[PDB]
Structures are given as C-alpha cells and as structure tokens.
C-alpha cells in the first residue's frame, strides 16, 4: 500500500526495484546478467532479460523490459527513453513518449511475476470539449497508437481511455474517463 519498492542489485552493480513481500512460500526470482541488459548512468537497470520465477508448482519464464529499474511485462520499448510517471504495489503509469506526450500506458502489478504487466489499458488526455469531434478523437487516438504500438512486445488488444487529466494520485488513473476508443 504505502510501502516503497525495494532496490536490489545485480553482481555488476546495476540496480532494479520491485515489490517482494515475505510469503515464506518457497518462491524464487532469478534475473540473469544478460547481453541485452544495460545500466543507465543513473544506476538503474534498463533493457530486456529473460527471468525465471518459481512458486507453488509453477515456473514462469517471461522476458521482462526494465525501465528505471522497474521490471515491465508485455511491453518492450527497446532503448526508447520513457518516464515512469507513478509506480506503486498496485499499478505503474508509463509516459514521457515524445511522439504522443498526453498519452500513457497503465501496467498492473502481477504478484507472480514480481513485475508490472500491460493488459491493454492506454490513457489519452483530451478535453471533453474537443471530443465533440469524432475526427479529433480519431486523430488523437491514431497518434497514440502510432507512438505506443512499436513498444507492444506482442502487438496486442489496445483500448484508449479518454480522460481530461491523468489521475496519478488514484489507484485507477483513468477514473473519470468519458470515452473508450478501441485500438489495434
């Protein structure tokens, strides 16, 4: 809830950050030092890596993409510099996409992955007054699609939630959405 993400280091010295609570469940997470992993000058892990998770008779081997130390699933921005607008144990908001500055991706924390995962929720900040024009809606959404589609590890279902302002202070930052435009 109010808890901060915990920082962990790779042997080389680079740092990653996620939520790990002690469930004494025998669970494990292994992040191999890999050739696709990079360290930022800020000391935070960046890049992609295959992780091995084991818990309760299930092994998962997702390829995760790190941004500012945060492990992300279902998104691979390669080297693109994005910003984590907000991150907590419930959700992470991805922004700073110069190609669509008023658009964001929502990633919900997946406990079994110890990472934030993209499940299709994109948020587009647009004045309700402007949304009285189906053409202006289409252009804003087309722009967000163009900017975010290349980062979708698996190009996947993309729904654009139109809001007047992102509520980074809320668990659901798209609360108050007035319109939903399906993407591709």
């Amino acid at each position: 809830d109010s808890a901060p993400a915990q920082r962990f280091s790779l042997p080389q010295g680079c740092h990653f950050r996620t939520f790990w609570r002690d469930e004494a469940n025998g669970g494990s997470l292994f992040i191999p030092a890999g050739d696709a992993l990079r360290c930022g000058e800020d000391g935070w892990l960046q890049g992609s890596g295959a992780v091995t998770l084991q818990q309760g008779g299930q092994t998962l081997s997702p390829t995760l993409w790190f941004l500012q130390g945060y492990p992300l699933a279902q998104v691979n921005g390669g080297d693109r510099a994005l910003t984590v607008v907000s991150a907590n144990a419930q959700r992470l908001i991805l922004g700073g996409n110069p190609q669509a500055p008023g658009s964001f991706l929502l990633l919900t924390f997946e406990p079994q992955l110890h990472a934030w995962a993209f499940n299709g929720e994109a948020i587009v900040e647009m004045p309700r007054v402007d949304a009285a024009d189906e053409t202006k809606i289409k252009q804003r959404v087309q722009q967000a699609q163009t900017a975010w589609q290349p980062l979708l590890s698996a190009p996947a279902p993309l729904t654009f939630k139109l809001v007047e302002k992102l509520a980074a202070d809320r668990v659901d930052p798209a609360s108050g959405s007035y319109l939903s435009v399906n993407g591709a």
Partner: protein
C-alpha cells in the same frame, strides 16, 4: 560466475549456509544478501525453533530473490 542471493531476515534471525554460521544483517526493509559461486548450498534461517530452509542452486551470474519456507508448519 558469481550470483547475489537476497532473502528477508528479521533482527535476531540466524543464517547458516551448509551449517556454517553467516554474520549477515538485514538492510533496507529487512533484506539480506550473500554472494555465491556456482554450486548447491543449504540456506537455513532460524528464529529460535522456527526454521526456514531452501536449497540454493547457483550456476549462472545474476541475482536471486528467495522466500525460504518454514519447515514443520503447524497444520502440515
């Protein structure tokens, strides 16, 4: 190849690797670490009669996050 192994530890908990006492202290948010070469190790974390155990199998370089389970849990 060397790997880092992180585990949650409370003050007063004793850590042993293969029976050998390890003077590790929990850090930010009660997390402790060991740097290990390739191999198998018997991690034991004891809090009085409470025993948490996990076999660590290190092979490649990287970082492990582990949550050792309590042995002999009441109800088992």
């Amino acid at each position: 190849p060397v790997a880092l192994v992180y585990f949650k530890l409370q003050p007063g908990e004793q850590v042993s690797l293969d029976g050998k006492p390890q003077q590790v202290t929990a850090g930010e948010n009660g997390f402790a670490s060991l740097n290990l070469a390739p191999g198998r190790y018997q991690l034991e974390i004891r809090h009085n009669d409470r025993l948490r155990r996990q076999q660590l199998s290190i092979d490649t370089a990287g970082t492990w996050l582990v949550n050792p389970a309590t042995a002999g849990l009441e109800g088992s």
